[PDB]
Amino acid sequence: QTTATLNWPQQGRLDNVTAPLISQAPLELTATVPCSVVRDLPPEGGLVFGTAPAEGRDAALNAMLVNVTETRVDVIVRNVVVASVNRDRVAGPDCQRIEITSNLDGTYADFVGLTQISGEDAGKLQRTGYPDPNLRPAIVGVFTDLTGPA
Amino acid sequence: ELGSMVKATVGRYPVYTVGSANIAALRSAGDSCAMADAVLVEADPNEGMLQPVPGQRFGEYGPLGGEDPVGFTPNGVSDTLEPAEPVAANPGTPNSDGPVDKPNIGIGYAAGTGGGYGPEGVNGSRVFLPFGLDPSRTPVMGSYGENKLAAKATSAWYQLPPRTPDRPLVTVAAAGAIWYYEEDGSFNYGQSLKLQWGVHRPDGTYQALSEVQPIDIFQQKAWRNLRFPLAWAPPEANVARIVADDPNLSEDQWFAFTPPRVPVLQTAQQFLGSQTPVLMDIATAANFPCQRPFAERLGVAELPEYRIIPNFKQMVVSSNQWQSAADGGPFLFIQALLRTEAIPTYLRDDWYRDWGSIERYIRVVPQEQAPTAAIEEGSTRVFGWSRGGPIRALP
Amino acid sequence: VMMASMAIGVVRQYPTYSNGWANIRAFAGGCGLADDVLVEPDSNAGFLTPLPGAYGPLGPLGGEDPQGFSPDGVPDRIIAEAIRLNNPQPGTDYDWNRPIKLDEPGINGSTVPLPYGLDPKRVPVAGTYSTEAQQESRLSSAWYELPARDETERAAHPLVVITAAGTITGESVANGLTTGQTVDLEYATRGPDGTLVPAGRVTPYDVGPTPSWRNLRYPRSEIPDDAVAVRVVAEDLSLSQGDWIAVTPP
Amino acid sequence: GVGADGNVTELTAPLVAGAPRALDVTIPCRAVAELPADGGVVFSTNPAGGIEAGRNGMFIRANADVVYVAFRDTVAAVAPREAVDSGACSEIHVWADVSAVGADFAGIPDASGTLPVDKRPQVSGVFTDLKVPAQPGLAARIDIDTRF
Numbered sequence A: 001q002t003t004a005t006l007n008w009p010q011q012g013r014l015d016n017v018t019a020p021l022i023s024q025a026p027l028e029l030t031a032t033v034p035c036s037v038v039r040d041l042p043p044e045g046g047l048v049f050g051t052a053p054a055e056g057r058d059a060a061l062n063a064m065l066v067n068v069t070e071t072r073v074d075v076i077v078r079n080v081v082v083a084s085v086n087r088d089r090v091a092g093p094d095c096q097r098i099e100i101t102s103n104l105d106g107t108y109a110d111f112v113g114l115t116q117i118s119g120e121d122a123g124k125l126q127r128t129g130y131p132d133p134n135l136r137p138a139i140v141g142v143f144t145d146l147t148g149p150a
Numbered sequence B: 001e002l003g004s005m006v007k008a009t010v011g012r013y014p015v016y017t018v019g020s021a022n023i024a025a026l027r028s029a030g031d032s033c034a035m036a037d038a039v040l041v042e043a044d045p046n047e048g049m050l051q052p053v054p055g056q057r058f059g060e061y062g063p064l065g066g067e068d069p070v071g072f073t074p075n076g077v078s079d080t081l082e083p084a085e086p087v088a089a090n091p092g093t094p095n096s097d098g099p100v101d102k103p104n105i106g107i108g109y110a111a112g113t114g115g116g117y118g119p120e121g122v123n124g125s126r127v128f129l130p131f132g133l134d135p136s137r138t139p140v141m142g143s144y145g146e147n148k149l150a151a152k153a154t155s156a157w158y159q160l161p162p163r164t165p166d167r168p169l170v171t172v173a174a175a176g177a178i179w180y181y182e183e184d185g186s187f188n189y190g191q192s193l194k195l196q197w198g199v200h201r202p203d204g205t206y207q208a209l210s211e212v213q214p215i216d217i218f219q220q221k222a223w224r225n226l227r228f229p230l231a232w233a234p235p236e237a238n239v240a241r242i243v244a245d246d247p248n249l250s251e252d253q254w255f256a257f258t259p260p261r262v263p264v265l266q267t268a269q270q271f272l273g274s275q276t277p278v279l280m281d282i283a284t285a286a287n288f289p290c291q292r293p294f295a296e297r298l299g300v301a302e303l304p305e306y307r308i309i310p311n312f313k314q315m316v317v318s319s320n321q322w323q324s325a326a327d328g329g330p331f332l333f334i335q336a337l338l339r340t341e342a343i344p345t346y347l348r349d350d351w352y353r354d355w356g357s358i359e360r361y362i363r364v365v366p367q368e369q370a371p372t373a374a375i376e377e378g379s380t381r382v383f384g385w386s387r388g389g390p391i392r393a394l395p
Numbered sequence C: 001v002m003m004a005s006m007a008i009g010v011v012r013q014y015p016t017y018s019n020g021w022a023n024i025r026a027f028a029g030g031c032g033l034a035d036d037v038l039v040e041p042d043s044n045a046g047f048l049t050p051l052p053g054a055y056g057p058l059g060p061l062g063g064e065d066p067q068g069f070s071p072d073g074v075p076d077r078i079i080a081e082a083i084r085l086n087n088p089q090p091g092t093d094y095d096w097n098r099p100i101k102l103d104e105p106g107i108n109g110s111t112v113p114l115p116y117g118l119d120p121k122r123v124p125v126a127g128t129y130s131t132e133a134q135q136e137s138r139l140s141s142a143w144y145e146l147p148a149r150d151e152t153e154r155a156a157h158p159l160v161v162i163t164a165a166g167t168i169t170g171e172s173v174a175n176g177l178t179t180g181q182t183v184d185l186e187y188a189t190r191g192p193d194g195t196l197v198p199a200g201r202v203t204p205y206d207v208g209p210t211p212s213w214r215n216l217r218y219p220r221s222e223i224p225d226d227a228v229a230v231r232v233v234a235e236d237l238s239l240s241q242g243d244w245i246a247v248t249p250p
Numbered sequence D: 001g002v003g004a005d006g007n008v009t010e011l012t013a014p015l016v017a018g019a020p021r022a023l024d025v026t027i028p029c030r031a032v033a034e035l036p037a038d039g040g041v042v043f044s045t046n047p048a049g050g051i052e053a054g055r056n057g058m059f060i061r062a063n064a065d066v067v068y069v070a071f072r073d074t075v076a077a078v079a080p081r082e083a084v085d086s087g088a089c090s091e092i093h094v095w096a097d098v099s100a101v102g103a104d105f106a107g108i109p110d111a112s113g114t115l116p117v118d119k120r121p122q123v124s125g126v127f128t129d130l131k132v133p134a135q136p137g138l139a140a141r142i143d144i145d146t147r148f
């Protein structure tokens, strides 16, 4: 069998990419976004990256979005809020990465460097997600809102 | 086919069955109404409303969101509460005028379950309250339009009357997309609405005993009545509250609710006796052999005062179609002269059963002015081949 | 019966697309339906000039005395060649999810979204629908010029089309002459003194759904070679609320 | 019926077969000026609050500029209001029998109509809107279709 793998940023340029899959879902999706790119978006923020245009039809219902508002860093996968965090905490000088793994085990977003502060735990890591194998996003490309050198 | 009918009657007894009705008619030698004795009706569904325990503090709206209502709003309900999926009646149903070349599909509501707007409320809601619920006494909280929050709500404790075998119910009106468990253990997806019991300590505070999921009769978006029997509550509970979660961000995953209430549950034979005119549909006309259908004498009909309906799927596919106004049914002079209401009704001991309903008829023009007319009967001696003209029967 | 049924259609539609003429053209380097279907690249060219005069607030589309027509007399969710329902559908177009208004009034004063990519700053509208009081509506537009007198052109421009919505009556193939309110096309002639006399009328070719935005067809073979100008005569005589019409210049 | 004090009272007669076999009306003319400068619905045959009232009834109206007499849903015999209520015509005959359906205005030159015989109105009562006690020219007569 011949395999195939899609990576992004292709050539050190943060340009959008289209690659519509016929099966509508990959096998595995691993994304590692540093916490030093949140402090570059405008205060209103936008899409750090995604697998569908933010204004497409049912893009949040079908795809995976990593949004940055004025108050939140959110990871939405098929209308399931995963690992929501307050903005200025990631903007603080303690965040290292954000790892958004999604495979047959489940969708799990990690906020390496951060620990929980509320929500019945207040003592564990910010690893948040769901062990559902049907939460794999629908891939059409990679669409960001950044620009310039990657 | 004999045991499935003997066991259904032996079990499930002294509850309702055709066998039980026939046995009662034989033992009473005739004077016994079949189904108008096992049905409990609630007239005036505004005296059984529950009242919050005095000495509590609330949020911005009132005693329906406890202290921190998040994403839940009084005007948080939709307007078109049509079902997410129609009924899709099966082919071959006897009393249905559906074309055999395509599936028969329709929608329906009871009286105003799914309506629009009305006067204001004690929370500022422009929502129409069904079942005759007064808006000046009935707050509302909803969660429509919050597609980016996934937010919850919790209510304040509502007191409970003393235990009595004639008020075995606590009732809520939701009109949402709630998760519930059927009797056979199955489930409908929906969203989370529950209810907590509790013991309000006189020389102390509340207890928060246990949580309970609702039981209903149909999967729909319009207004309804979720039920919590008092046989589920411990013998020492005295207060109740409401808990809502709504964690889904989809567009059509929301719900609303209303303060709970304990009905009064008068039977269905004392309510409407054997003299009041009643419109009984084609399916429910054999189970009420003591009610008087409205009479037609000289081409004019007398107007009914109540309407007895079969279950929802039977109604919307046979009763609203067979008796249409375009087909000559009794709706010709009913849609033009009378408006409908709804009465909340229950079987005596089967809280999981979707039996039909009862509606009240209100005249568009009162009867003080516009009274009934005189007919001035006469007679002629027509022959056997006259046929003066045809009947206007083409709508 | 089968042989005659399939041999009659070949003779009736000729020289347009039939299932046995395409198989014969395929030998001489021919396509299928791709040779007999005509598409409008830009559906904004070909609007006729109204002869000068004095009109009211509806522009030249509404003539001297429009009775019951208003520019924004259209319901909310009216789309091109479809019927917008409540819950979404799989293969919808872009205009299913769009603002009900336009936020800018057109050249007519209306705020209705126009189909086929028609610029609201050039294409007026007029409608009969109302929500307060029903009425009998009439309309007779100005005289719209016809292009020229040449057959080389008519070999390539064999149509006069009107974008309309409502409950129009017209001629179809699947269901001939479905009744309803009327939108027709009057054509005029000249005279030795110099004037435009009303003499003639053409009925449309409806193919689209009932309440949608669609195209009414008038082949230029019905209109004679002495016709000088063209105008729209619309009439809605039903007092029901779900019986309305709406038109646009030819 | 003498009405409340001296006026005329409405009626209710839910015909089972829908349309009658004779619907003579014969309404006067000068007894229309009582309408409040924008006439209501003088002598409907279905209540104004029904589901489809105008879609099945008779519905004489005044409209404050033109008085007209509708039918199932179509218009017959429009007439100007200032010409009518001034006293030009006498009666507003609305005979709606079988093999005849019209709305004659009886005095205005070209304010008379005629409809196909399948435009018969559905009768469920007599619902006027005037406050006129009793005229010699104000009548109504409905024949119920009792053939079975």
Ligand SMILES: [Ca+2]
Pocket: B143, B146, B147, B150, B246, B247, B248, B249, B250, B253, B254
């Ligand atoms: Ca929601």
Ligand SMILES: [Ca+2]
Pocket: C128, C134, C135, C236, C237, C238, C239, C240, C241, C243, C244
């Ligand atoms: Ca109209």
